[PDB]
Amino acid sequence: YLYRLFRKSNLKPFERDISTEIYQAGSTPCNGVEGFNCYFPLQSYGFQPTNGVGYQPYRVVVLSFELLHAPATVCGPKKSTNLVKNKCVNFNFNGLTGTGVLTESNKKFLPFQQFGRDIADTTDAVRDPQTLEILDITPCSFGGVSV
Amino acid sequence: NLTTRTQLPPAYTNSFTRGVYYPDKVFRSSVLHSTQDLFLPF
Amino acid sequence: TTLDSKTQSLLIVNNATNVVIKVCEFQFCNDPFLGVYYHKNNKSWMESEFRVYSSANNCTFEYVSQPFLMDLEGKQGNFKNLREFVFKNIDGYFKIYS
Ligand SMILES: C=CC1=C(C)/C(=C/c2[nH]c(/C=C3N=C(/C=C4\NC(=O)C(C)=C4C=C)C(C)=C\3CCC(=O)O)c(CCC(=O)O)c2C)NC1=O
Numbered sequence: 001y002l003y004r005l006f007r008k009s010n011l012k013p014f015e016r017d018i019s020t021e022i023y024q025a026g027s028t029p030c031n032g033v034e035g036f037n038c039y040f041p042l043q044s045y046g047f048q049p050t051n052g053v054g055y056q057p058y059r060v061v062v063l064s065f066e067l068l069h070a071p072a073t074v075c076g077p078k079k080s081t082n083l084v085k086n087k088c089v090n091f092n093f094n095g096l097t098g099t100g101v102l103t104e105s106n107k108k109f110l111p112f113q114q115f116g117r118d119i120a121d122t123t124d125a126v127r128d129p130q131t132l133e134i135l136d137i138t139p140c141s142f143g144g145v146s147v
Numbered sequence: 148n149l150t151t152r153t154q155l156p157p158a159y160t161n162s163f164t165r166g167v168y169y170p171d172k173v174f175r176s177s178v179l180h181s182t183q184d185l186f187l188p189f
Numbered sequence: 190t191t192l193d194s195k196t197q198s199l200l201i202v203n204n205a206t207n208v209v210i211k212v213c214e215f216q217f218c219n220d221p222f223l224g225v226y227y228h229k230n231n232k233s234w235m236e237s238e239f240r241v242y243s244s245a246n247n248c249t250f251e252y253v254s255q256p257f258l259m260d261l262e263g264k265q266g267n268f269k270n271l272r273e274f275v276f277k278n279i280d281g282y283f284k285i286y287s
């Protein structure tokens with residue numbers, strides 16, 4: 001298990017660096033070999049089984065994703081139900097949680113697009129996951145009421 | 148290696164109304180959306 | 190960055206059958222190419238030589254799509270098609286728009 005001890009600049013996010021060029025600590029280049037004031041950029045960890053807590057090897061994983069803007073492929077553990085149409089429910093289309101009647105639609109979604117937003121930036125077009133079809137949404141608490 | 152070469156000065160051309168990409172993956176119709184990003188200048 | 194196998198390097202290539210994308214420590218030649226070669230027995234042009242890199246090692250990402258056959262023959266006349274692409278490199282993602 002090794003770590004990059006020296007680099008002439010810090011990284012950008014999500015950038016890998018597996019180079020092994022010798023890092024010139026001094027101002028004099030040493031033509032890529034080891035010597036004085038120019039050191040090997042990688043250093044190996046020392047993980048003894050009986051060394052301090054701050055030196056014990058820790059396994060890390062990072063799950064990086066982006067939510068509710070593209071066709072989902074990973075789904076949660078929830079079991080699906082059958083949608084109740086022309087009546088307003090607590091729907092759940094690939095993660096979003098709202099309230100409103102649903103209706104059919106005939107918009108021409110590009111294959112790489114899965115959502116559709118109106119001027120207000122709210123959802124006005126959706127694609128059902130199981131059934132490939134384009135629909136639209138409206139609220140149900142609507143209409144003014146004068147007394 | 149290839150050596151049958153004849154160098155010339157770098158030729159230039161005017162690129163106009165080119166280098167526009169969809170900035171996201173959301174369906175959007177009848178909207179005058181504005182964005183700021185790495186775009187090819189007109 | 191340097192393109193001399195001291196650092197990683199991306200390489201996108203259609204070899205007339207598939208498209209291969211390799212991010213791998215290539216030691217490139219000064220004049221990379223693809224060698225199409227022409228046959229006299231039949232009027233068929235085919236790719237024969239692949240001399241882009243002298244080596245490939247220490248490498249993680251690699252993709253090859255489905256196979257496809259494409260007309261690489263010598264077509265005489267105007268450019269009957271245009272292809273535009275845009276390449277960006279933002280926070281560990283190499284974005285290709287086509
Ligand atoms: C090298 C990488 C490479 C990429 C990234 C690529 C992308 C690409 N090319 C396509 C079509 C196509 N692309 C080409 C030709 C080309 N298009 C190119 O980027 C290049 C380099 C050529 C050939 C030199 C042709 C002939 C078609 C289908 C028929 C046509 O559009 O005329 C398609 C659409 C596939 C489909 O929806 O059915 C994609 C995604 N093809 C490639 O070979």
Ligand SMILES: *[C@@H]1O[C@H](CO)[C@@H](O[C@@H]2O[C@H](CO)[C@@H](O)[C@H](O)[C@H]2NC(C)=O)[C@H](O)[C@H]1NC(C)=O
Nearest residue numbers: 007008009010011012013015017190191192196
């Ligand atoms: C990406 O690569 C380039 C060159 O390969 C790096 O730019 C050089 O960085 C060193 C010090 O790190 C400088 O001495 C050079 O003057 C730089 N050259 C140029 C053209 O910029 C660049 O630092 C690398 N990017 C990152 C995030 O490390």
Ligand SMILES: *[C@@H]1O[C@H](CO)[C@@H](O)[C@H](O)[C@H]1NC(C)=O
Nearest residue numbers: 148149150217218219220243
């Ligand atoms: C000629 O080929 C060798 C190795 O293929 C390469 O080192 C050299 O740079 C090339 N010289 C020219 C002028 O192409």
Ligand SMILES: *[C@@H]1O[C@H](CO)[C@@H](O)[C@H](O)[C@H]1NC(C)=O
Nearest residue numbers: 204205206207209239253256
């Ligand atoms: C060239 O295309 C063939 C057939 O698809 C493929 O097997 C091969 O991997 C490609 N060449 C390289 C170097 O990958």
Ligand SMILES: *[C@@H]1O[C@H](CO)[C@@H](O)[C@H](O)[C@H]1NC(C)=O
Nearest residue numbers: 018019020214245246247248
């Ligand atoms: C890089 O390649 C060389 C030779 O194959 C090898 O000595 C070295 O272990 C490799 N390093 C990595 C991170 O793969």
